[PDB]
Amino acid sequence: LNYSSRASAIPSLLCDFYKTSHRIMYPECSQIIYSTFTPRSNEQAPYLTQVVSFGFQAFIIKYLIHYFNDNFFSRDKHDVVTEYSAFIEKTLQLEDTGEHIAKLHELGYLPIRIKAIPEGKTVAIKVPVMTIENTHSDFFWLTNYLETLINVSLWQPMTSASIAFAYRTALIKFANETCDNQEHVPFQSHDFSMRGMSSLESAETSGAGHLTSFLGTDTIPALSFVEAYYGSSSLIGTSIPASEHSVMSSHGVDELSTFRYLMAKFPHNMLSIVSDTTDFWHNITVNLPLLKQEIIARPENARLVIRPDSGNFFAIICGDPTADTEHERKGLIECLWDIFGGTVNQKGYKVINPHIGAIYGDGVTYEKMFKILEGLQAKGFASSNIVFGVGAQTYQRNTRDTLGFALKATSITINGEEKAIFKNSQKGRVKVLSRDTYVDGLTSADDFSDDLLELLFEDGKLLRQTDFDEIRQNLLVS
């Protein structure tokens, strides 16, 4: 973490505005507020049956430790309190001395206790993934206050990780039906989403979620994000040289020459060449046969990969039986089988010559991925014959309501006595008993041994840390 970005967010005003008004609205003698973070529904995305825990450690380190230490506890105090009071004065014409902020500063740490599902473990929809409460009686308001920051930063990484897991589940099922092994699966979903994410910070946490199930990515800052907040012994992620449309068109319309030029620039690496700049099917039916000898001479670890980027997703890959030309009635995959070799595997499915490959990365979604694999299976082609560039239409096109994430207060302690709070509904303290069952009737005095929610952060300290190997291992056993 040896770089820094300049920031504007005020540590004591990093919230929905109305949170600044709640402190004096709570009953007198309020002491503790306890809240839960739960994915409440997959109605908007029934294919996500499983929530991957991911992002907590990075969020704790980036914000609850470093941001508050760098920008609040490290800072003067008179300056920090004055900034807070002046903002309340301007916006409400209330005179809030900021004494609660001064007291927080004097403490020197966040009096907060957090438990969470270990990252890489999985939970059913509606099972809580994290709980938060304050540990000092003067700071009941702090649990309230932090709600906005917690879910603005955590629902995206868990949603992307859960999406990637559901992709991986489907890829494994097609591999079990149609392939002799699943060695291709870690590379079969390749994150393309970076430019289509809404900010660099969202690209980092989303792309990190993708990497919990997959190795392939172009989102470089996601790799370095994982390296900084998790670390790893094994390779975090990988990618390959690949051309873009501006490269192809800058060489003019003779794409046969361009292919030869690009393959000569990268003789010892896999190389993706986007193939639809001028005439996609001309490249397939004319240029690939002319290039065949050169292609099959390359080392197998340096295979040429064909990238279409236009057309109907299903027709381009699987063929369109209504089409006017033979090459279009078959898809890219069958055409590559026709031009290059292949074998028939033990399951009875066609596996194209490994000197050629195909990646499809135009608006890929789970549903489109699934339909393509079904179409190839129906034609007797193994699911390993294609890679998916999985982009912003998968990872950006979500909301907090995709998995129904909500942080809700479930218990308040007033004048020494714990009370359930709810709208009419989790009530009281919770304990996760298994991946699919929890119990909520609880008080702080109850047992809590073997809780799937494990203590993570307390009073300024990250008490439990993981690396990205453990996360991936957890997700393997899942």
Which position has the token pair 């203590």?
455
Which range in 130-138, 191-199, 414-422, 451-459 contacts ligand NMN by CB under 6 A?
A: 191-199
Query: Which CB sits closer to its own copies, 423 or 449?
Result: 423
For the range 419-423, what are the long-range contacts, defined as Cβ-Cβ under 8 Å and sequence gap of 24 or more? none
Query: Does 392 help bind ligand NMN (rule: CB under 6 A)?
Result: yes
Query: Does 361 help bind ligand NMN (rule: CB under 6 A)?
Result: yes
Query: Does 291 help bind its own copies (rule: CB under 8 A)?
Result: no
Which residues, in sequence order, are CB contacts of 45 under 8 Å at separation 6+? Answer: 398, 402, 403
- Residues composing the chain: 478
H/E stretch holding 419 reads: strand 417-420
Which residues, in sequence order, are CB contacts of 208 under 8 Å at separation 6+? Answer: 54, 55, 58, 157, 160, 161, 222, 225, 226
- In angstroms, the first-to-last Cα distance of the chain is 31
Q: Which amino acid would we find at residue 364?
A: V
Which range in 192-200, 331-339, 371-379, 416-424 contacts ligand NMN by CB under 6 A?
A: 192-200
**Pair 244, 274: CB distance under 8 Å:** yes
Span 49-88, contacts to its own copies by CB under 8 A? 62, 66-67, 70-71, 87
Min CB(210)–its own copies separation in Å: 13
Residue-wise over 64-77: b if at least 16 C-beta within 10 A, else e? bbebbbebbbeeee
Which position has the token pair 């900034």?
83
Query: Which CB sits closer to ligand NMN, 298 or 307?
Result: 307
Which range in 18-26, 166-174, 333-341, 442-450 contacts its own copies by CB under 8 A?
A: 18-26
Query: Does 193 help bind ligand NMN (rule: CB under 6 A)?
Result: yes
Which residues, in sequence order, are CB contacts of 152 under 8 Å at separation 6+? Answer: none
From the list ligand NMN, its own copies, none, which binds 289 (C-beta under 5 to 8 Å, kind-based)? none
Query: Does 309 help bind ligand NMN (rule: CB under 6 A)?
Result: yes
Pairing type for strands 417-420 and 405-414 reads antiparallel
Q: What angle do CA 228, 232, 235 make, to 5 degrees?
A: 110
Burial of 139 (0-12, 13-18, 19+ CB in 10 A): buried
Span 111-150, contacts to its own copies by CB under 8 A? 144, 147-149
Query: Does 321 help bind its own copies (rule: CB under 8 A)?
Result: no
Min CB(363)–its own copies separation in Å: 8
Span 221-280, contacts to ligand NMN by CB under 6 A? 242, 272
Gap between the Cα atoms of 222 and 138, Å rounded: 38
Backbone angles phi, psi at 412, to 5 degrees: -130, 140
Span 435-474, contacts to ligand NMN by CB under 6 A? none
Query: Does 194 help bind its own copies (rule: CB under 8 A)?
Result: yes
Query: Which CB sits closer to ligand NMN, 11 or 311?
Result: 311
Query: Does 257 help bind its own copies (rule: CB under 8 A)?
Result: no
Which range in 166-174, 188-196, 203-211, 416-424 contacts ligand NMN by CB under 6 A?
A: 188-196
Q: Which of 84, 167, 192, 337 binds ligand NMN (CB under 6 A)?
A: 192
Query: Does 187 help bind its own copies (rule: CB under 8 A)?
Result: no
Query: Does 383 help bind its own copies (rule: CB under 8 A)?
Result: no
Closest CA to 134 of 109, 98, 155, 106: 109
Instruction: List the x/- string, 200-229, binding to ligand NMN by CB under 6 A.
Output: ------------------x-----------
Which three-class secondary structure state does DSSP give residue 466? coil
Q: Which residues bind ligand NMN (CB under 6 A)?
A: 16, 18, 192-193, 195-196, 218, 242, 272, 307, 309, 361-362, 389, 391-393, 400
